[PDB]
């Protein structure tokens, strides 16, 4: 047993090749419409693979009109997670991602102006495996 | 890896579908039979010797050649009497077909694109011991021929019009009579000759 | 079909081309067809009383019209296509392209395809 | 080759039909041709057998190899049994310009044999400076070529062209002028070594086969009692070494049913099988020992799932033809008997020589399929053993890993439908004293048998 | 790394060209009905853009009958967010917005009379990009 | 049906096989059929003027084509099948297999099935 | 010209040379010339041709051969391209064709009224001592030279003009990887990898960085082998 975890402080995100360091939350899932069909002879139900659909959520603190200006244009997100206790890093890129809705306006009271972005991506590439 | 190629012949075009056929491809096969019911025995099935005209239907979209030109091309091909050659790689289909119905659609968004819904029909030619005439005859040549050095009018007739003895059909055309000398046997390189039909 | 030739007319000079003998320069069937196509394109429709309603185009009348840019593109395509296709020698006309070079000054291309441009099946029993 | 379209045609018999076969068999074959004193593997290709050992039906090699291949064996381990006195066909060809007729080239067959390989050399009609070098097997042409007159090029060309799998050239001396014209000069001095094989010679083949691994062993169509006893002892010894070899035998041609049953009762090991009926194929009679080759081939090819309880054999006729009483007597005696049924020769009941005891659950040991199943499981278990003996730490985790591997192997067996139930666990009794170099475990399984008989009762 | 965030205190809202400074929460999103269709040859599912639908939520503290009097008439909302640590501002306008429901009445106990407004807007214009 | 035999032609040597008497080695119906099948496969279509459109194949023309690997597999199957099946003796041709051994250099197999390979029902009233 | 092209290759300019033997040279002379210089950047035309009733020497035909090879670029190849020519001389048998192609000679062949180039080869045929086999064909050499030219073009934007830190090296690697991904989108390549050259990077400095790569080019289909089981 040893400490080799990773923290979000090590996260580095390149939105269209530009460091959007102000984003403090990101999650992306690559889900599949797995068809589950039941066969006559088998007690247990058979699950068959389907096509894959990429979705991603990205929210942070506003510092400019980057996303509102961007619109629904296709772009790329390169996510890099680097291990600091030991050398090594994971590096993912979402091959072709688009927004589902522009966070045009959002604000409340004296709270910091937070921004939330949600969208979909067609595919991905795994560049580093740790 | 799945692709769809439409190789037209009367118009020397080889259309490759930019986008795969959306949800699914499907093809049915149904044997030719019809019930006959005999007294005090009941129904029986009798095979019919022929084969059935089965369809392949799917729907695509043409993203931003332009989709307008592609739609015009396919609409023009729909009226074509000659058959189209449809090749589907992963599905495994390959054979002559013809388009029964074609349709395009523009949507509220994505106005540049054109959603397509096309259907095909299997094509069979009517020819109206020795080798069977099973081969399809889908080969096309230009309606005007440039005579080569080694060509003779009988050779031109056989290469470009079939039986070979069809040369007087080429000769009797007045333009051919004018460009060609009055002797059909003697012909020169370079001069243009017009096959009939 | 038995189409026939005509005499050349150099539209650049607006005069018939004549040989040194003084006779007008005769031209082939296809050359006369091209000359006719250009002349018909240049001839407005319904206005020159020597001709029927079939001959001519209406491109000039479209300039004063209030239809939009793309509507005018479609109108130009329709007008040129209808004007050309009356000739028996015509098979198909299309592949239209447009280029609004300046703000409102246009350049357009088209292809005309002849009956001889058809492709023939090779087969006999 | 140049870019372009190339095409060829072949008979359907020449398809690579070797895919999907099962099982391994061994044979100490008498052969007129091929390598001597060594084991060779064939992938069930009749052309391969023809090339390696010829196509002489008089010799046991081609005959019994063809019968084995007809049994659908995945791999046949053939050994060329020999008497000694081994020699290869050889010949020496000589120069013309030297009045002494100097020997310049020596030819030799690729392998020892006694076939009539011959050479014919004639003046090349197009050019006297060259000559035609045609090589024969008896009256039949076997290879032709025209070569430059220098000795080294002649030897290289004879060793170069594709169809020289039979003969190899060698230079004795150099000369400037072509060899002398000759016609059909036999490669004398060779010997196949098949003349008067000794009883002792089979032991060399057995010892060479020991290093290899195979599912079953069958004799070379010989019913000598001494050889059968020696092979019995040899197979027992190999069983003591962990190699479970299944033996197939056939009684002598003149032995009657009484002698066959006495022989079967005399040795009743489950690893031994006796063939009790001669057969015919291609109008050629086959002794019970020869038929045992095909029986072993079929048993090995069936592997685990299949069985030869009622397999329709390739044979066309049998002798003797037994009544039901004689059939019962032979099968009770442990004899394997082929029977003729409506134009088809069919093996009956899959039995082996083990029929004396059958006092329990030992009943199942009387059938060849059960013994093959047990031996295959033992072989797979030994294969998994040898990866871990003294090479994995003998802790609880390692023992659990080994048990998981064995359980997953038996689960793969379950997926084949072979077994209805199985269990593998720790042998707690032996594990109380086990150590690093070896671990002990126990198992038992319920094999699914092939349906053999039907009993009907019509209530009317 | 530097502090260049923005807070809701800097928010300035012009409802039909009139400063409704009493609103202490605003958010507007510009969402798109992205069609996601699965292709025969491609493992990953293809997402195609669609039309855009603007929605906005605006709630604050009541001080008059402005919204009840307004009704469902079309109007415009100009949202201005100004950076105070450094000069620069973002300025958005919702081109044509309409209410989805009038907050006709709302009150409870001794709590301040809060007002919540929700509606839709056809389009927007981005006037300042920071 | 009454098909007939022909004379052998060793394609390896490209010469007719002749007996010691000098006469060409006659062959059976099926042997001549196999020779014809190989020759027809090797004969390009539409190019050798001695033949009709029925005879020959178009395998060589497919090499220069731009279709993909699987499309070329289907084209090869179609071409070989169409070329072979014109013969009356042919019943069915299929079971095609392909092996792209190198990057772009192919080996393919096929099975031809004869009319005599059919299976006959045994029944009479 | 051979020496000049070699010198330009030393300067990083990968120029592909096309040549044709003299009109009076027979097949023996052509093969001897092709074997004498067997550089992959050199091509020998071994057959004269005719067009518009005008004869063209092999040197003249080399112009059209070079034009076709250059126009095909990366994706295409001239392995069986149907040339514009109408007649050829000499007409070679299959044995002579094999001799010429083994010699590195590029030969046009007449097939059913069409003059067709055969096998895309260059003069490099002497060695072919494994993966150097692929260097004998013009398409592979053009592919390699085009990749080298693109890599040099990307190099000259960064030599002594971007800071030689880990971030800059990663940016350069990303640019190269994306260029090879664009090549992947064309279907040219089946697999590729580009990474850091750790061996040379141990001693690299500001003015230059070192990297390594290798890719599997997709070749044009050239031959078919059929076997009819009957």
UniProtKB/TrEMBL annotation, chains A, E:
Highest taxon in the source lineage: Viruses
Q: Name one Pfam family in it.
A: DUF2001
Q: Which InterPro entries match?
A: DUF2001 (IPR018989), XkdM-like_sf (IPR038628)
| Name of protein | XkdM-related protein
Organism this protein belongs to: Clostridium phage phiMMP02
From TrEMBL, chain B:
Q: Which residues form the LysM domain?
A: 143-194
Q: This chain belongs to which protein, by name? A: Peptidoglycan-binding LysM protein
Which species is this record about?
Clostridium phage phiMMP02
Name the PANTHER family for this protein.
PHAGE-LIKE ELEMENT PBSX PROTEIN XKDP, POTASSIUM BINDING PROTEIN KBP
- What Gene3D superfamilies does UniProt report for this protein, alphabetically? LysM domain
InterPro entries, alphabetically? Answer: Bact_Kbp (IPR052196), LysM (IPR018392), LysM_dom_sf (IPR036779)
- Per its UniProt entry, which superkingdom is the organism in? Viruses
From TrEMBL, chains C, F:
Which domain of life, per UniProt? Answer: Viruses
**What's the protein here called?**
XkdS-related protein
Native source organism of the sequence:
Clostridium phage phiMMP02
Automatic annotation (TrEMBL), chain G:
Q: From which domain of life does this come?
A: Viruses
* Parts forming coiled coils: none
Tail sheath protein C-terminal domain residues are 130-230
Tail sheath protein subtilisin-like domain location is 1-123
Q: Which family does it belong to?
A: Belongs to the myoviridae tail sheath protein family.
Name assigned to this protein: Tail sheath
What organism does this protein naturally occur in?
Clostridium phage phiMMP02
Full-length numbering of the shown residues? 243 to 472 of 473
């Amino acid at each position: 047993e040893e400490a080799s975890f990773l923290n979000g402080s090590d996260v580095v995100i390149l939105i269209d090749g530009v460091e959007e360091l102000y984003m403090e939350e990101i999650k992306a899932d690559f889900e599949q419409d797995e068809q589950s069909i039941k066969l006559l002879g088998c007690q247990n139900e058979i699950s068959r693979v389907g096509t894959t659909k990429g979705s991603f959520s990205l929210n942070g603190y506003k510092t400019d009109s980057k996303f509102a200006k961007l619109g629904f244009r296709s772009f790329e997100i390169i996510y890099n997670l680097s291990n600091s206790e030991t050398l090594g890093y994971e590096s993912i890129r979402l091959k072709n991602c688009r927004l589902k809705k522009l966070p045009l306006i959002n604000s409340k009271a004296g709270e910091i102006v937070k921004i939330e972005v949600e969208g979909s991506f067609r595919g991905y590439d795994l560049l580093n495996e740790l | 890896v799945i692709d769809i190629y439409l190789k037209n012949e009367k118009e020397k075009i080889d259309f490759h579908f930019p986008v795969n056929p959306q949800d699914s491809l499907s093809i049915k096969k149904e044997k030719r039979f019809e019930t006959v019911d005999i007294v005090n025995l009941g129904e029986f099935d009798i095979k019919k010797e022929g084969e059935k005209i089965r369809e392949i239907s799917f729907k695509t979209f043409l993203p931003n050649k332009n989709p307008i030109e592609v739609v015009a091309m396919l609409e023009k091909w729909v009226d074509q009497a000659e058959p189209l050659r449809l090749i589907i790689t992963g599905f495994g289909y390959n054979g002559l077909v013809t388009i029964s119905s074609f349709s395009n659609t523009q949507t509220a968004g994505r106005e540049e694109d054109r959603d397509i819904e096309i259907t095909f029909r299997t094509y069979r030619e009517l020819k109206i011991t020795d080798l069977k005439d099973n081969r399809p005859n889908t080969q096309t040549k230009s309606k005007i021929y440039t005579v080569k050095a080694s060509d003779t009018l009988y050779k031109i007739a056989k290469n470009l019009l079939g039986k070979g003895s069809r040369w007087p059909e080429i000769y009797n055309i007045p333009e051919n009579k004018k460009v060609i000398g009055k002797n059909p046997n003697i012909i020169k390189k370079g001069k243009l000759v017009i096959p009939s039909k | 079909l038995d189409l026939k030739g005509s005499f050349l007319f150099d539209f650049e000079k607006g005069e018939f081309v004549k040989n040194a003998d003084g006779t007008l320069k005769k031209c082939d069937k296809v050359q006369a067809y091209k000359q006719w196509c250009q002349k018909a394109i240049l001839t407005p429709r319904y206005k020159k009383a020597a001709y029927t309603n079939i001959y001519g185009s209406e491109i000039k009348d479209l300039i004063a019209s209030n239809l939009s840019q793309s509507a005018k593109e479609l109108e130009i395509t329709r007008l040129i296509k209808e004007t050309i296709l009356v000739h028996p020698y015509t098979k198909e006309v299309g592949e239209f392209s447009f280029n609004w070079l300046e703000n409102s000054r246009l350049v357009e291309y088209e292809f005309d395809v002849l009956t001889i441009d058809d492709e023939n099946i090779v087969i006999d029993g | 080759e140049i870019p372009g379209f190339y095409n060829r045609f072949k008979a359907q018999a020449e398809k690579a039909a070797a895919t999907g076969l099962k099982g391994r068999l061994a044979m100490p074959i008498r052969a007129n041709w091929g390598d001597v004193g060594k084991v060779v593997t064939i992938k069930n290709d009749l052309r391969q057998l023809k090339n390696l050992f010829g196509d002489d039906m008089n010799y046991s090699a081609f005959k019994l190899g063809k019968l084995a291949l007809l049994g659908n064996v995945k791999e046949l381990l053939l050994y060329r049994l020999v008497d000694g006195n081994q020699k290869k066909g050889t010949l020496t060809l000589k120069d013309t310009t030297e009045n002494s007729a100097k020997d310049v080239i020596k030819l030799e067959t690729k392998y020892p044999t006694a076939r009539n390989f011959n050479v014919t050399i004639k003046s090349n009609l197009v050019d006297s400076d060259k000559k035609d070098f045609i090589f024969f097997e008896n009256t039949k042409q076997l290879f032709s070529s025209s070569i430059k007159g220098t000795i080294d090029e002649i030897v290289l060309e004879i060793n170069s062209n594709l169809d020289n799998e039979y003969v190899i050239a060698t230079k004795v001396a150099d000369s400037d002028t072509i060899l002398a014209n000759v016609v059909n000069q036999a490669l004398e001095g060779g010997n196949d070594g098949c003349t008067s094989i000794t009883n002792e010679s089979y032991l060399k083949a057995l010892e060479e086969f020991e290093r290899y691994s195979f599912d079953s062993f069958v004799l070379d169509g010989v019913a000598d009692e001494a050889l059968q006893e020696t092979t019995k002892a040899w197979v027992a010894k190999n069983k003591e070494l962990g190699k479970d070899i299944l033996l197939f035998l056939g009684g002598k041609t003149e032995d009657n049913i009484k002698q066959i049953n006495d022989k079967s009762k005399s040795f009743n090991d489950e690893n031994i099988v006796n063939v009790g009926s001669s057969a015919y194929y291609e109008n050629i009679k086959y002794t019970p020992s020869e038929v045992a080759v095909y029986i072993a081939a079929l048993s090995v090819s069936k592997g685990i799932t299949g069985s030869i309880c009622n397999a329709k054999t390739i044979f066309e006729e049998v002798e003797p033809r037994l009544s039901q009483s004689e059939v019962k007597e032979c099968l009770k005696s442990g004899t394997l008997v082929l029977d003729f049924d409506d134009g088809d020769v069919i093996i009956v009941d899959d039995v082996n020589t083990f029929k004396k005891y059958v006092d329990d659950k030992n009943e199942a040991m009387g059938y060849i399929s059960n013994i093959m199943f047990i031996n295959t499981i033992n072989k797979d278990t030994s294969l998994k053993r040898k990866e871990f003996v003294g090479k994995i730490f003998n802790d609880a985790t390692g023992q659990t890993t080994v048990i998981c591997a064995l359980k997953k192997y038996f689960e793969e067996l379950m997926s084949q439908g072979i077994i209805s139930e199985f269990n593998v666990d720790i042998d707690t009794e032996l594990q109380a004293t086990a150590k690093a170099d070896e671990f002990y475990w126990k198992w038992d399984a319920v094999k699914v048998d092939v349906m053999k008989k039907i009993y009907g009762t019509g209530y009317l």
